[PDB]
Write a protein that binds this ligand. Sequence first.
Ligand SMILES: Cc1cc2nc3c(=O)[nH]c(=O)nc-3n(C[C@H](O)[C@H](O)[C@H](O)COP(=O)(O)O)c2cc1C
Ligand code: SF4
Lengths: 428, 56
Amino acid sequence: KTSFGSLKDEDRIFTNLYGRHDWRLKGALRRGDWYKTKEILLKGPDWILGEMKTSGLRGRGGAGFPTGLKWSFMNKPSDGRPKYLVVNADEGEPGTCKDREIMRHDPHKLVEGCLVGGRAMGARAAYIYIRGEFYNEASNLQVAIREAYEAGLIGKNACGSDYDFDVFVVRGAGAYICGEETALIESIEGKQGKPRLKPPFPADVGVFGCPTTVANVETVAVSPTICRRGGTWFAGFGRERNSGTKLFNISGHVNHPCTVEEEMSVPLKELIEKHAGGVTGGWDNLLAVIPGGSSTPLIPKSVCETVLMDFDALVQAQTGLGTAAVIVMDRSTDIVKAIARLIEFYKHESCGQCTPCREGVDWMNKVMARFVKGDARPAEIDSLWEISKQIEGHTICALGDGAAWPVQGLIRHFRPELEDRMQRFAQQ
Amino acid sequence: ASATRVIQKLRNWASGQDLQAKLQLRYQEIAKRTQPPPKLPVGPSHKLSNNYYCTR
Ligand SMILES: Cc1cc2nc3c(=O)[nH]c(=O)nc-3n(C[C@H](O)[C@H](O)[C@H](O)COP(=O)(O)O)c2cc1C
Ligand code: SF4
């Protein structure tokens, strides 16, 4: 129960995450899919949510929320309306490739996850919203749905079970904000990809004005094998409050950037040394890390050597776990240039219906470009901090928070660099 | 200033105190009427940070 960060292929939950065996039914049916799903469905909804709550599965999207507590919000019976299971695959955050590499190379896991999660809730059908640049991945997923329908696993009698289900595939048009809980819903409904206020929560009035439970791809893809193997098996991996396996993307300034499944609460130094062989120039050359995709602040190398890859640990580290896409710097890098690029990204991808992210994101883009050039004075860094704290909680969605947190991480750990650039520009 | 040095003595005597040093009329001892540009300071509350009107 300590220093536990590496596991074996018996427990690999995405066994074909490298396209080495197959992705169709004849080859995913051999890796342990659709085995006893009929029995799982005939068991009941309460049993699946019990497996969920016992597994301690937190949300494998950005926000880590305990499922079971989440999916149980619409266990309640029908008010003469349908119910739906929307799956989030608008993999728009930087560093994130895990939903891509499950979508291709393992779609039947996701389909079984949709079906089991719907029977855990109630759901006439599902709507797998997928990114628009993911055309071929969506085509592979549609072939998988075709194969499942033809095989007798979805439709009128899904795996027997006297439970009828459908798995639709919606296809976005190139927005990052549509990965929100409710912006996804609005774009499905056929409007601008603009979030909603929350309340009303999607579990009472959601897509088409009907209840929903949004869920990441891997959050549902890991559910049926959790029911087939048990939550205690799944809770053994990770701490008491941070549990499970986890897909890990490792990006930038390292010898072998890859996507890897690994045990939660693994140390990040183990993560980069074992997998994705050590950073360019070795540990001598590291400057900083961004464990989340881009909506999480930096690490100045003082607290990445002895810090675990978890929600609670990184929260204690004044950071956070998101999609667990690690990005790495190597002391060859204008860091202000990087965070200014991230803020340019957040500016491009802002929807614009709530004023803080509509204005302050462009404030901070201009200010950080100015810092990159160095045409400011050190009395503006505290001002930038104040703009961040204004944007933080006074927005609708969490994109303002995601555009504020990197700036905070930079000011909190690399303020002498900004000061150096300012005095350089001043003296010249 | 133009007091011929003997009327000067007359007036300083009759009044009883030297007034050629403290004259009523201004000749060259005063500010020239064109002056260089200033640059006024700027007071507090231009702090650029930690300056919320709610606090003051
Ligand atoms: C701007 C923004 C973008 C997001 N993009 C994604 C995304 O691309 N994929 C994803 O799974 N979640 C994304 N989220 C978080 C979703 O709300 C979350 O995935 C969804 O609610 C499922 O929650 P879960 O992780 O508990 O299953 C995004 C949130 C915000 C604010
Ligand atoms: S924070 Fe930005 S993306 Fe989110 S609702 Fe406001 S304007 Fe739209």
